[PDB]
């Protein structure tokens, strides 16, 4: 680039040798005998002289292992007789030694001085690797090869991992790099990337072994980066075979998080829900099924289940995603003014227009704003009911500024608006908690007070969509559906609709067997 002359040849020699020293018997397993002798060699050859030189050396070392990989993958295709396992072994031989050198340098700097120089050096090397990665990725394109970086990153992570507080500084370094290499930035690195963020040691340290759960918000960012990446592809129905592999991969990862860390998915459900497209029933149902471990959910199918008596109906869930922020400051002010006064009455009339941040003919609605409005109005309603000295009931939730918004949106919006609006209500029908109960009654009231068949059809659609898909199915959603199908308002709706379109009846028949 701006490399002093002979530096590349000098570096490529030093590394070529370390690769030979690393595999030697004398090195000492950890390679410490070989390393002390190697640091000295680096001093006399003057590669450690300046910060810029240490930087250039690390970049040149990375560039060499990348060439060794392209050269290996070349004599793989240009000769099919050559063994793929033997070719892969040539890459690892070189990559592993380069990893040991980095790990031993970072470790040595941490011993000799402090954890801040150690960490700064760690970030310096990752920054350099990311840099080589993005250059290769952008130049080689369709020929880009993920193996050097993927092997470097995991081996280094594993080498550095084995105080606890000191390990958080190292996890943070890796998290920042993983976020820098998120698939919207490095799409050609996506499979290696998902293999990195979902690695059994990474998941463990990040979610289980980091204290006071400081690793939880960082992990959630990486999952949002994944969902944000998949969203346009998922939204556009058809998915390529490579995309289906990534989608099922995401399913496996999430299924592990749902089983091992349910409280994690539970706490960040709003966050994930804001980035997952509404058509991804099963994906979203995994996040909406997450509930705290030691909590007994009554069977939704128990006959004569009075839900209004479960002590959990008065406890609000934890929401770690500050949803209120999406609201334009004037809109939130006008909303708060309406909630406490029922003024201006023009706020309702302008509401549909405000939810239509249509700068594009394709977006049509501001979906994030639709969700925050719904959750905000419900939370404020739950507060206003409790403060008035009551429990959210089918009788307490009605004839309030809160229900005026929901009943307005239900009528005034078009079929796309309404679909998006009801999905926002349905995303709160989860484990037994005050939000599950509030939005269950709201949805049940909206159907029963509907003056248009369309409002009724759409509520049935969002609920049935979510139960016709394979398991898991949220508790609250099942409870709501079971309650709806009992209402005479539904029995009447069903009778007139099933007489006109009969294949619809097979959909309802699916729910008996399919459901939890």
């Amino acid at each position: 680039y701006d490399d002093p002359p002979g530096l590349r040849e000098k570096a490529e020699y030093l590394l070529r040798e370390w690769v030979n020293l690393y595999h030697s018997a004398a090195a000492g397993r950890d390679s410490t005998k070989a390393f002390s002798a190697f640091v000295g060699q680096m001093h006399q050859q003057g590669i450690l002289k300046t910060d810029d030189l240490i930087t250039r050396f690390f970049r040149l070392c990375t560039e060499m292992c990348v060439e060794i990989s392209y050269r290996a993958q070349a004599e793989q295709q240009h000769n099919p007789a050559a063994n793929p396992t033997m070719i892969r072994a040539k890459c690892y031989h070189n990559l592993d030694a380069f990893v040991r050198l980095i790990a031993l340098l970072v470790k040595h700097s941490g011993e000799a001085t402090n954890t801040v120089t150690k960490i700064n050096l760690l970030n310096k090397v990752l920054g350099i690797v990311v840099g080589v990665l993005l250059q290769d990725h952008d130049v080689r394109q369709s020929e880009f090869q993920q193996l050097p970086y993927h092997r470097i990153f995991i081996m280094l992570l594993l080498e550095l991992n084995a105080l606890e507080t000191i390990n958080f500084q190292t996890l943070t370094a890796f998290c920042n790099t993983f976020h820098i290499l998120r698939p919207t930035k490095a799409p050609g690195f996506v499979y290696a990337w998902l293999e990195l963020i979902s690695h059994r040691i990474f998941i463990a340290r990040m979610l289980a072994h980091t204290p006071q759960q400081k690793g939880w918000p960082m992990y959630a960012q990486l999952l949002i980066d994944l969902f944000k990446y998949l969203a346009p592809f998922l939204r556009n129905v058809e998915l390529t075979k490579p995309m289906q592999i990534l989608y099922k991969g995401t399913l496996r990862v999430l299924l592990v998080l749902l089983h091992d860390f349910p409280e994690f998915l539970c706490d960040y459900h709003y966050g994930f829900c804001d980035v997952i497209p509404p058509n991804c029933i099963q994906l979203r149902n995994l996040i909406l099924s997450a509930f705290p471990r030691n909590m007994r959910l009554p069977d939704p199918f128990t006959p004569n289940l009075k839900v209004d008596m479960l002590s959990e109906i008065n406890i609000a869930p934890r929401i770690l995603t500050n949803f209120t922020g999406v609201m334009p400051p004037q809109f939130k002010k006008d909303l708060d003014s309406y909630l406490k006064t029922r003024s201006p009455v023009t706020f309702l009339s302008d509401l549909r227009s405000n939810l239509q941040v249509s700068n594009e003919p394709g977006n049509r609605y501001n979906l994030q704003l639709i969700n925050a409005l719904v959750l905000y109005v419900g939370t404020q309603a739950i507060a206003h009911i409790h403060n008035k000295g009551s429990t959210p009931s089918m009788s307490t939730i009605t004839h309030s500024a809160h229900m005026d918004i929901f009943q307005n949106l239900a009528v005034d919006l078009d079929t796309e608006g309404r679909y998006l609006f009801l999905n926002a209500i349905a995303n709160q029908l989860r484990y037994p908690n005050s939000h599950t109960h509030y939005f269950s009654c709201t949805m049940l009231y909206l159907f029963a007070e509907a003056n248009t068949e369309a409002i009724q059809e759409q509520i049935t659609r969002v609920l049935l969509e979510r139960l016709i898909v394979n398991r898991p199915h949220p508790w609250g959603l099942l409870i709501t559906f079971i309650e709806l199908i009992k209402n005479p308002a539904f029995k009447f709706w069903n009778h007139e609709f099933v007489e006109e379109e009969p294949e619809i009846e097979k959909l309802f028949q699916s729910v008996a067997q399919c459901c939890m």
Partner: protein, 148 residues
């Protein structure tokens, strides 16, 4: 028109780069240390065959059930793994002792003739990794220097 054109040029580019990445997906072995003898060779196996190992095979109690030959095979051709650690543990429990120098597992055939603080001397059965077989050695002197 073409519905894929509803994606942005950047999303079309991202899809291209991911699609290319699929042609060379990461291999199970890219994420684990080198296997000199039994590397991963994933292949299609019929569904009627056991696609997964027996339940609780990951315990030292399971490895104790295995033959000594199976355990020495794990110890030599599966070095640096949990499997090798389980094999060493099962062999130790099965009263075998690893010689640090000769790099072989020895078991007392009978109680030793002599026990001092520097060595142990007597008849031993050992596993020869060169000739791949169990072999006796009378009047052998196991120096404690090479025993943990």
């Amino acid at each position: 028109g073409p519905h894929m054109l509803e994606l942005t040029k950047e999303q079309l580019y991202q899809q291209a780069m991911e699609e290319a990445a699929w042609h060379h997906m990461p291999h199970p072995s890219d994420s684990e240390r080198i296997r000199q003898y039994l590397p991963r060779n994933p292949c299609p196996t019929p569904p009627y065959h056991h696609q997964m190992p027996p339940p609780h095979s990951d315990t030292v109690e399971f490895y104790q059930r295995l033959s000594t030959e199976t355990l020495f095979f794990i110890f030599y051709y599966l070095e640096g793994t949990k499997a090798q650690y389980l094999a060493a543990k099962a062999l130790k429990k099965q009263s075998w002792r690893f010689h640090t120098k000769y790099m072989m597992w020895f078991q007392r055939h009978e109680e030793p003739k002599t026990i001092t603080d520097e060595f142990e001397q007597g008849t031993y059965i050992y596993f020869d990794y060169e000739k791949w077989g169990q072999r006796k050695k009378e009047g052998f002197t196991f120096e404690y220097r090479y025993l943990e």
